């Protein structure tokens, strides 16, 4: 049924704040309604009754209710801050404790860019809403209710007059709503666009140099740089229109407050004062109901992060380690799989099917195959990143769905096809797999992935700074300082998925060569899609169309295995 | 938000005249929306002192006669000032986004005149972020912020000249508060800055910690990192809890303290105004003149002090735009081409070139190429078989040497007349998310599609394009996304052979193809190499074979040359980096 988790727990905890914040605010509001009656009174039992202290003492009285409704505006901003802001750590850290726990399958249904801004942008959002229920989301309306009240209690039969300036303002604001959002989204249509024609001519540029076609694309950006133009004044103009007409309307009301209100003071109904404290309330009620209106076309966009960030909370991990587990001291390195098959999802057909192969501790084997035959998610196995719909996936004739997650994934060791480093140092990349690696481990990890002489030539060298994503080294040097983080974590496996790509042929040998004897004892993957690469493990496993080909030697796959020969065809 | 510091501009006042000068031309509707303004500011200071008036004519000396005489004033004088605010208000509108459509117009058509090297230099989301921001900045000022400043400053002395000829002491009276105003918004104001620029920090780094470990959610678990990831996450987060409360109150206390200040305003103007009232000093419809003013100092007063520095900020804008209209554009020297009809011959001579003039990449690169003939520049990365293709194209002048066509030197023939007599694939070209139809035809534009067909379909393109979703009109939204990397490859190899240049560079990627594309990209390239000299990069087997002339770079400079069975013979660098690559006869 999706998930019965709420947001409304990480408020609960500080009710309290989030009691006191709106508290504080009627203390303003009432403070903020009492002024101009008591202006009213000095005029109407102050002046016209000739007595100094009355319009002395209320004036003071007027002063004080000023510096209370200030200590009540604050201490209501105050704590819808604190309660606002703890909700937010609250909900972040839940959220972000959530994201930790996702398989790959779970980051495969909320697309990567959309989880980040769930836990950043949402995230604030939702804090903000918080911070907007306790002091806005309560002053405007108090401030329309209550002004109405007063005016209400001020002459009954005038307040007759809000009757007819309200309709036609709500009238106002859904007209605007209701045709000003289809335009404003046409205005985010015409914006985007402009980008597109920006971005691929600064991405293509040579390709549209080359081909001397500028003046097509100068052609072609005017189209969407008028669009833009016509959509914005549409839009705006709406907007522009709105505003004064508001005004107006507020302005016609003091209008008929001082003409309606005329009669009923020369009727001796209402004296003089009571119509000015009138005009004011008149106003408080009015621009209320504008700030009314705003919140209100906030609420509907807050909502949306409220689902968003309610899915992740919802989300169940697809990867679980049973209730008795197995504890897995050591690993020896046999890797099976019994007829696995596995899709990513239900639509397509099978990325792996029939898979039936073996591989004994210390074996060098070279998983081998064009693009997408499946070799990365195959590797994906071992550490139980994925389940098989069909079969399962053993390590030393376990089933891995039967085995304590950190032990196992404690003696896999991957390189991932996509290098990934994280703030600090280099030697802190690369002591993830163990803290209390010594240095000298790290240099020989280093020197073995090719890397050591980079880094040591680096001004603050193995101190050096690795970027938040990794992104002032290149391709090469950072897939080689994966390799070194691999090695560090002396694994039992050890999985290489394409983790030579962005490095020379020259050093690439070199790696390879250090490693058979360095990966002493340590059963050992090197998938590629080069026969070059596969000939430097003792066995060859290859993968077509998603299925096990032909596992043997060069020898025996050519003569069987049309897909290597298929291969071996393409690459000579 | 927060500004950080006040913007370092160089001569403002010349970027102003600049940029009035894309003003100038509409010049009469600007006065006129000014004195718009002016007027509407001015009836808006007057509706305080009518209804003030109306107060003291109709209502107290009871003569009600009179009253649909005022209440008709203003029924008038409310109706133009609404009319003028939908005036001012619209006149700018489309004026507005006219001077921004133009300043994009010339930012755009500078785009393509701008070098090459401007692209390369710094990435590409920053400069339009930063471009288009600082568009959109003098975008708010130059229709609003402008003119919302000259109103408020208008209406400001006008009702404070208005409220001294009613009455001098009461008017010292109100604008006493001005001074509370203007103290309190400054010490808050810092308040709100020094912490909006904390929080901003530790948001930052918690923000940034949260993208990574996203991101490489893969990594963290095989390396079972949760639990320190966790404790990561925690100790910023727990500190951004602690600083995003002060962050979020400074900023919030503004309102009530401004609000509080209105109040305080409405009580002297009572007390004071119904005090002097009664010593007859001043009337009463005078008072409530006076409230209606109240609320004329705290807020109003705010909105001047940061218009002024949004406008600031808008000219450093304008500065930026200015110098990036100011780059020099790539122009053809007065004798250049057009080239003679030729088939095609190239020659480097004593070459230097490197895009940091520090660091040297090429050096004293120095060969000679056949019309017809296949040429194969290989080598180890880092070596300048890359930057190769670009001093060819011109996208860079060569710094030492020259390079010519035909027997021209290159810097001496229009950019319009190589590009056209020189083709280019490269390891990654670029699709635009269009029909591939019109993909196709953006080399030789007026092309028909039925000879775009049988062109496709000697290149191995047109049996995969039918078997497309909407077949040529297909769109390839996202660049391509949506098709294979080698489909793609094959469809620049296509694009490329329409343009049908006398000279064809092409570096073809094999990283990621399937066997089956393989061979159709392959088979294409020979269909396209053919009746034409074509500088291959060696990634295939097959082509450093073929090649009338292999070319071995290394650290910048020619090594060997000569075929490839004189390279391996000869026991020169060309056999080591071929054997530690195809050393795979060892098994046969
Ligand atoms: N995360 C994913 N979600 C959905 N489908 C996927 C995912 N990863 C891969 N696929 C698809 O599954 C098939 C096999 O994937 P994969 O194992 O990554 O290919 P591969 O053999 O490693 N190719 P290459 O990476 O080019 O060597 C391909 O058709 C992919 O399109
Ligand atoms: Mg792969």
């Known amino acids: ?572 | 938000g927060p500004i950080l510091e006040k913007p370092a501009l160089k001569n403002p006042t010349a970027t102003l005249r600049r940029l009035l000068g894309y003003l100038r031309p509409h010049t009469f509707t600007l006065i006129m929306v000014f004195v718009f303004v002016t007027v509407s500011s001015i009836l808006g200071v007057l509706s305080p002192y009518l209804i003030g008036k109306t107060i003291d004519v109709v209502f107290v000396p009871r003569r009600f006669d009179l009253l649909p005489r005022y209440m008709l004033i203003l029924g008038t004088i409310y109706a133009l000032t609404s009319l003028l605010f939908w005036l001012q208000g619209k006149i700018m509108l489309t004026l507005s986004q006219d001077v921004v459509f133009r300043l994009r117009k010339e930012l755009f058509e500078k785009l393509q005149r701008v070098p090459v090297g401007f692209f390369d230099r710094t990435p590409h989301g920053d400069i339009i972020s930063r471009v288009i921001n600082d568009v959109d900045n003098i975008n708010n000022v130059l229709g609003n912020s402008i003119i919302q400043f000259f109103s408020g400053i208008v209406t400001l002395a006008g009702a404070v000249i208005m409220m001294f000829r009613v009455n001098v002491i009461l008017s010292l009276v109100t604008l006493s508060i001005v001074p509370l105003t203007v103290l309190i918004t400054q010490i808050v104001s810092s308040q709100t800055r020094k912490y909006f620029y904390e929080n901003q920090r530790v948001l930052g780094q918690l923000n940034g910690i949260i993208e990574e470990d996203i991101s490489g959610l893969t990594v963290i678990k095989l390396f079972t990192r949760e639990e320190k990831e966790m404790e990561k996450f925690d100790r910023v987060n727990e500190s951004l809890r602690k600083v995003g409360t002060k962050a979020q109150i400074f900023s919030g206390v503004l309102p009530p303290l401004m609000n509080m200040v209105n109040n305080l305003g409405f009580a002297l103007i009572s007390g004071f105004g119904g005090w002097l009232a009664l010593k007859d000093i001043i009337t009463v419809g005078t008072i409530a003149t006076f409230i209606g003013y109240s609320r004329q100092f705290t807020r109003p007063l705010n909105e001047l002090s940061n218009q002024f520095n949004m406008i600031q900020m808008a000219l450093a804008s304008a500065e930026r735009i200015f110098e990036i209209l100011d780059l020099e554009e790539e122009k053809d020297d007065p004798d250049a081409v057009e080239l003679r009809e030729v088939r095609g011959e190239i020659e480097f001579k004593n070459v230097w070139f490197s895009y940091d003039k520090k660091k040297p990449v090429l050096k004293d690169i120095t060969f000679h190429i056949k019309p017809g003939q296949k040429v194969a520049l290989v080598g180890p990365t880092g070596s300048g078989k890359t930057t190769i293709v670009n001093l060819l194209m011109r996208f860079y002048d060569v710094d030492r040497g020259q390079i010519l066509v035909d027997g021209i030197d290159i810097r001496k023939i229009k950019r319009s007349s190589l590009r056209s007599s020189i083709g280019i694939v490269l390891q990654d070209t670029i699709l635009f998310s269009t029909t591939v139809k019109e993909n196709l035809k953006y080399g030789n534009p007026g092309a028909t599609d039925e000879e775009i067909k049988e062109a496709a379909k000697l290149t191995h393109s047109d049996h995969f394009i039918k078997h497309l979703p909407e077949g040529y009109e297909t769109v390839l939204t996202d660049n391509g996304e949506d098709l294979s990397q080698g489909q793609r490859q094959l469809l620049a190899i296509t694009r490329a052979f329409l343009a049908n240049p006398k000279i064809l560079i092409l570096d073809e990627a094999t990283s990621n193809v399937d066997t089956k594309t393989e061979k159709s990209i392959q088979a294409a390239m020979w269909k396209l190499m053919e009746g034409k000299t074509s500088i291959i990069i060696a990634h295939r087997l097959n082509t450093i074979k073929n090649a009338d002339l292999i070319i071995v770079l290394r650290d910048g400079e020619i090594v060997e040359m000569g075929k490839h069975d004189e390279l391996i013979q000869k026991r020169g660098f060309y056999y080591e980096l071929f054997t530690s690559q195809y050393g795979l006869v060892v098994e046969k």
């Open chain 1, 1 to 572: 049924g999706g998930g019965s988790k709420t947001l409304a727990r990480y408020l609960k905890p500080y009710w309290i704040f989030a009691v006191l914040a709106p508290l504080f605010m009627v203390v303003e509001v009432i403070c903020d309604l009492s002024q101009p009656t008591l202006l009213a009174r000095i005029v109407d039992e102050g002046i016209a009754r000739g007595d100094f202290s009355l319009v002395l003492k209320t004036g003071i009285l007027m002063l004080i209710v000023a510096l209370i409704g200030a200590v009540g505006g604050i201490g209501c901003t105050v704590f819808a801050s604190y309660a606002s802001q703890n909700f937010g750590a609250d909900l972040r850290r839940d959220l972000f404790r959530k994201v930790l726990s996702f398989s790959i399958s779970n980051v495969n249904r909320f697309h990567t860019s959309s989880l980040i801004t769930r836990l950043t942008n949402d995230v604030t959002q939702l804090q903000n809403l918080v911070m907007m229920l306790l002091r806005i989301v309560v002053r405007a309306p108090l401030l329309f209710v209550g002004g109405i009240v007063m005016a209400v209690s001020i002459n009954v039969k005038l307040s007759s007059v809000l009757i007819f300036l309200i309709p036609p303002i709500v009238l106002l604001f859904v007209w605007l709503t209701k045709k000003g959002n289809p335009l404003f989204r046409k205005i985010q249509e015409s914006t985007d666009e402009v980008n597109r024609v920006v971005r691929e001519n600064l991405l293509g540029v040579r390709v549209v140099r080359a081909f001397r076609r500028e003046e097509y694309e100068n052609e072609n950006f005017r189209k969407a740089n008028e669009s833009l133009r016509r959509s914005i004044i549409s839009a705006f103009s709406l907007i522009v229109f709105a505003l004064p007409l508001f005004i107006f309307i507020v302005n016609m009301g003091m209008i008929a407050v001082l003409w309606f209100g005329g009669v009923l003071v020369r009727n001796n109904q209402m004296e003089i004062g009571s119509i000015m404290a009138y005009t004011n309330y008149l106003m408080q009620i009015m621009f209320s109901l504008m700030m009314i209106g705003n919140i209100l076309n906030f609420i509907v966009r807050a909502s949306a992060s409220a689902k968003r960030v309610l899915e992740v909370l919802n989300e169940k991990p697809a990867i679980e380690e049973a209730d008795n587990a197995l504890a897995l001291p050591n690993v020896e390195g046999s890797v099976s799989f019994e007829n696995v098959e596995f899709r990513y999802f239900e639509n397509t057909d099978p990325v792996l099917s029939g898979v039936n192969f073996s591989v004994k501790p210390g074996s060098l084997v070279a998983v081998l195959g064009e693009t997408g035959s499946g070799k990365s998610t195959l590797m994906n196995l071992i550490p139980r990143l994925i389940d098989p719909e069909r079969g399962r996936v053993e390590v030393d004739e376990l089933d891995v769905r039967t085995v304590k997650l950190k032990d196992l994934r404690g003696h896999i060791s991957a390189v991932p096809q996509e290098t990934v480093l994280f703030s600090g140092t280099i030697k802190e990349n690369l002591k993830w797999g163990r803290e209390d690696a010594t240095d000298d481990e790290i240099v020989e990890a280093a020197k073995i992935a090719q890397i050591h002489d980079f880094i040591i030539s680096l001004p603050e060298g193995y101190d050096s700074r690795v970027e938040r994503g990794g992104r002032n080294f290149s391709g090469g040097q950072k897939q080689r300082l994966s390799i070194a983080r691999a090695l560090v974590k002396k694994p039992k496996v050890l999985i290489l998925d394409d983790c030579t790509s962005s490095v020379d042929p020259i050093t690439e040998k070199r790696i390879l060569d250090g490693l058979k004897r360095y990966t002493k004892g340590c059963t050992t993957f090197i998938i590629t899609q080069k026969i070059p690469t596969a000939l430097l493990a003792d066995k060859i496993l290859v993968l077509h169309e998603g299925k096990v080909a032909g596992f043997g030697t060069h020898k025996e796959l050519l003569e069987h295995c049309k897909p290597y020969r298929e291969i071996y065809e393409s690459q000579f």
